[PDB]
């Protein structure tokens, strides 16, 4: 079965051969689906306040 990763900002599905990995100073590993998610993360935008992210949809029971 195909092995898949998850984006830590949008909760999106990341397929093989793609993705951006960010290693924080505290050894925390952050994996982003695309440049949009990475830029929003580094701009300190909370995913739970963006309507299209999985976290927002889960919190709002969509």
């Amino acid at each position: 079965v195909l092995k898949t990763e998850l984006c830590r900002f949008s909760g999106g599905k990341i397929y093989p051969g793609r993705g951006i990995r960010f290693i924080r100073s505290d050894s925390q590993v952050f994996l982003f689906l695309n440049s949009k998610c990475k830029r929003y993360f580094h701009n300190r935008l909370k995913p739970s306040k963006l309507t299209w992210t999985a976290m927002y949809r889960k919190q709002h029971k969509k």
Partner: protein, 131 residues
């Protein structure tokens, strides 16, 4: 295994990076990179796992005003792993070593790249988390 694959260089000469070891140095100022044959006007550049010559600008007086080898363990410039994922660290870091590659200190403060750990067994043994 085999040999290290090329990765994007992001630390040209005059780059100043944090010192992640226990020696007492605060930062490392790169003056050259080992194994560089070079080209006209091209600045030598290092990446994670490279050995460089550096001086300590801030730290203990005993470590300042001299040249010592160092190995880069973290870099901010993204590089491509063979599986297609581009990855990068939060900061640029290195550790002071002797020419044989033995760590002058005893501990590493943060994570280190897998390439450096594979290249330098002593650094890997002194490391906390790899990648």
């Amino acid at each position: 295994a085999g040999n290290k694959f090329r990765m994007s260089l992001g630390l040209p000469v005059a780059a100043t990076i944090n010192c992640a070891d226990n020696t007492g140095a605060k930062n490392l100022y790169i003056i050259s990179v080992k194994g560089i044959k070079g080209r006209l006007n091209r600045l030598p550049s290092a990446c994670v796992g490279d050995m460089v010559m550096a001086t300590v600008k801030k730290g203990k007086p005993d470590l300042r005003k001299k040249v010592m080898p160092a190995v880069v363990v973290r870099q901010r410039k993204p590089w491509r792993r063979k599986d297609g994922v581009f990855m990068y660290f939060e900061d640029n870091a290195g550790v002071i070593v002797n020419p044989k590659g033995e760590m002058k200190g005893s501990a590493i403060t943060g994570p280190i790249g897998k390439e450096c750990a594979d290249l330098w067994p002593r650094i890997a043994s002194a490391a906390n988390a790899i990648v």
